[PDB]
Structure formats: C-alpha cells, structure tokens
Design an enzyme around this catalytic site. Structure first.
Site, PDB file in Angstrom:
ATOM      1  N   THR A 172      -4.800  19.194 -33.505  1.00 37.92           N
ATOM      2  CA  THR A 172      -4.241  20.377 -32.858  1.00 37.92           C
ATOM      3  C   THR A 172      -2.759  20.156 -32.606  1.00 37.92           C
ATOM      4  OG1 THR A 172      -5.142  19.461 -30.819  1.00 37.92           O
ATOM      5  CG2 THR A 172      -6.382  21.192 -31.844  1.00 37.92           C
TER       6      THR A 172
ATOM      7  N   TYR B  51     -14.132  21.522 -20.940  1.00 40.08           N
ATOM      8  CA  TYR B  51     -14.463  21.628 -22.346  1.00 40.08           C
ATOM      9  C   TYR B  51     -14.827  20.238 -22.878  1.00 40.08           C
ATOM     10  CZ  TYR B  51      -9.797  19.863 -23.683  1.00 40.08           C
ATOM     11  OH  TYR B  51      -8.662  19.103 -23.850  1.00 40.08           O
TER      12      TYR B  51
ATOM     13  N   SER C 190      -7.958   9.234  -0.526  1.00 40.31           N
ATOM     14  CA  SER C 190      -9.391   8.970  -0.429  1.00 40.31           C
ATOM     15  C   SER C 190      -9.784   8.826   1.045  1.00 40.31           C
ATOM     16  CB  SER C 190      -9.757   7.715  -1.216  1.00 40.31           C
ATOM     17  OG  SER C 190      -9.565   7.946  -2.608  1.00 40.31           O
TER      18      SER C 190
ATOM     19  N   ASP D  83      -2.942  16.648 -14.050  1.00 39.31           N
ATOM     20  CA  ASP D  83      -3.703  16.623 -15.294  1.00 39.31           C
ATOM     21  C   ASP D  83      -4.479  15.304 -15.359  1.00 39.31           C
ATOM     22  OD1 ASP D  83      -2.326  15.177 -18.166  1.00 39.31           O
ATOM     23  OD2 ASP D  83      -1.641  14.700 -16.156  1.00 39.31           O
TER      24      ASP D  83
ATOM     25  N   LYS E 271      -5.366   4.957  -5.171  1.00 41.75           N
ATOM     26  CA  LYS E 271      -6.713   5.341  -4.759  1.00 41.75           C
ATOM     27  C   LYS E 271      -6.778   6.810  -4.370  1.00 41.75           C
ATOM     28  CE  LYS E 271      -8.092   1.417  -5.700  1.00 41.75           C
ATOM     29  NZ  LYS E 271      -9.076   2.193  -6.541  1.00 41.75           N
TER      30      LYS E 271
END
Length: 329
Positions: free
Chosen positions: A114, A89, A256, A57, A70
């Site tokens: 919310t 959104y 990365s 998330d 990284k």
C-alpha cells in the site's frame, strides 16, 4: 481538577484551547492544554505528570508502554459509522489461489505494498518477514534488506533513486511512477490489490476488507486466498483465523498509576456528546481546519471506546503487531 491534554504541534494547541473554552461554554468538564514538540516528549510529559493524556498510534502506543513510562490506553478512537462502528482491522497477505508458496517462502517473489512505512502495507509485513531478512541493524535501512528479499515490488513513497527495485512494479506515468499518491495507480489499498490482481506481483499486503470492498462477486473472490503465519493458505473469509496482525485504532494513553482514567473518560464521553460528529457547528472535536488534518484526534473518528482495565500496550496491540514492532527495533 481538570485533564491536561498534550498537543504535539502549535495548530494542535489552537484546537485544544478551542476545546477547553468550548467545554466551558457548555459547562462541561474542564480541559487544560500543553504544547510539546513531539509525541515522545508528550509521552514523557504525561509520564512525569506534566500532562494527563494524549492520542497515539500503535507505534507510540508501543513506545509509551515501555519503562520508564508504563503508560496504557484508556480510551480508543472509533471509526466507521454510528450504524457500523469499527475499532480495528486485520493486516492480510493476499495472493491468487493455485500457488504453493507460503509466507515463509516469499523470497524472490514480487510484492505489492500500500505504501512506504504505512502500517498494513509495510510495518506489519516487513516486520513479520524479518526473520528471513538478511539485514544487520542500523544504520543500513530496512529498504535495503527488503529490496534484496523480493525480486521486485511497488512501494509508493520508496526512494526511486536509492531503491529503484521497490518501484519496479509501480505503474505511475513518468515521474509519477512510485509516487506516494493517487497519481500512482497501484497506490494505497485498492491500488495494492489491483497490483496483485493484475499479475504484476505475487502477494499483496493490505487489510482484510479491501478484498470485499473491491470484489463484489463471491465467486470472483474465491480466486484469492490468504497467507497465514502458520504457513498455510486460507480463504479471504477466514481473515480472523489467518492474518499477520490485528491492528487496533489510535488510543488515548494515560498513566498506569494515578492516571485519572475516569476524569479523562468522563471528559471524553461528554466532549463527544456535545462537540461530536455533526453535533455542533460551534466547535467540532473530530475535525481539522483548512490545510490541517488529524489534530488531537483522527478527523475520520466518530467517537471513543473505553479500554478495559489491566489492558496494557502490548495486550492492546496484539502479538502480530507487537512483534512486528520489536522486530524492526
């Protein structure tokens, strides 16, 4: 080789083993599995080359990208429908047209959230308002500061006992008041909006689409506008130019440097084409078993989206969001 997934839980582990031996059957790219006890542990693991990828998330997307990790998003979950897919959104601050206060003058007014610690209804708004918050850092909880910024609010999940003030505006019956569920009429997005719509509170922190989903009448929703960061108001149709933050979807993080971007991607494309949404009754990539939800990937997910190169965590997040996260750090 093979891409090594990281499960943060033991039920997650079972669906990965499931995934791996189901990729075998279909003679596709192999996937191994790793159990860990937390998203960060998985971030470290991937980090120190014990694993190859993991879905995270925003919050952990923030965290993973920091030194010494990284890590960077390489594949993005995709929600909506095959017809209408969406990878994000906008978190918006709604109000009823006619007022003069702006985002920088919400002190003492009434707010509608919310949920507690939910992104759009909390982490984005409270992290944005941070400059106006009279809050020392820890150990004093942010609720404290928020509880004394707005004169009253509804934050489903807020501790009625410690912070009663954050449950004033709520509308559930008896002990269901301020509860973090459908029992609370002003819960989630549509409850948040109605909170605002009913005149209970002056501003609603929700996402740009709740308006449209809930207000069918175009002349009905001309009765509302958006509070922009540049301390100006705007119609709900200008959300793109007037939001608190652009919230992207959960993304597959990877190294990365020497991350196996393509193995992971080639594995992701195929796993989808075979065990994707209503593709196989044998095994389903996006779907948790009974009692379990959002295992490995969001069950509400319907596919993935490749993340262009040179796109880090911060650029993936966006400033509104990225700032919203640091501000609360």
């Amino acid at each position: 080789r093979s891409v090594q997934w990281c499960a943060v839980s033991q039920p997650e582990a079972t669906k990965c083993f499931q995934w791996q031996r189901n990729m075998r059957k279909v003679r596709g790219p192999p996937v191994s599995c790793i159990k860990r006890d937390s998203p960060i542990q998985c971030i470290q693991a991937i980090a120190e080359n014990r694993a190859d990828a993991v879905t995270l998330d925003g919050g952990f997307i923030y965290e993973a990208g920091l030194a010494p990790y990284k890590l960077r998003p390489v594949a993005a979950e995709v929600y909506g429908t095959e017809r209408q897919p969406r990878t994000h959104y906008y978190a918006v601050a709604v109000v009823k047209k006619g007022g003069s206060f702006q985002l920088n003058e919400l002190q003492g007014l009434k707010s509608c959230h919310t949920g507690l610690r939910d992104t759009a209804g909390w982490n984005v708004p409270i992290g944005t308002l941070r400059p106006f918050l009279n809050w020392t850092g820890p150990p004093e909880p942010i609720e404290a500061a928020v509880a004394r910024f707005f004169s009253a609010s509804c934050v489903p999940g807020a501790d009625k006992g410690q912070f009663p003030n954050l449950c004033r505006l709520c509308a559930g019956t008896g002990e269901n008041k301020c509860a973090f569920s459908s029992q609370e009429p002003y819960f989630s997005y549509s409850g948040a909006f109605k909170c605002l719509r009913d005149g209970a509170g002056d501003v609603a922190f929700i996402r740009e689409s709740t308006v449209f989903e809930d207000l069918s009448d175009e002349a009905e929703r001309d009765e509302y506008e958006l509070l922009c960061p540049d301390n100006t108001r705007k119609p709900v149709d200008k959300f793109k130019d007037c939001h608190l933050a652009r919230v992207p979807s959960h993304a597959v993080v990877a190294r990365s440097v020497n991350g196996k971007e393509d193995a992971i991607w080639n594995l992701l494309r195929q796993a989808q084409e075979k065990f994707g949404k209503d593709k196989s009754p044998k095994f389903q990539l996006f779907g948790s078993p009974s009692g379990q939800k959002d295992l490995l990937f969001k069950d509400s997910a319907i596919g993935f989206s490749r993340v262009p190169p040179r796109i880090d965590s911060g650029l993936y997040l966006g400033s509104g969001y990225f700032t919203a996260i640091q501000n609360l750090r």
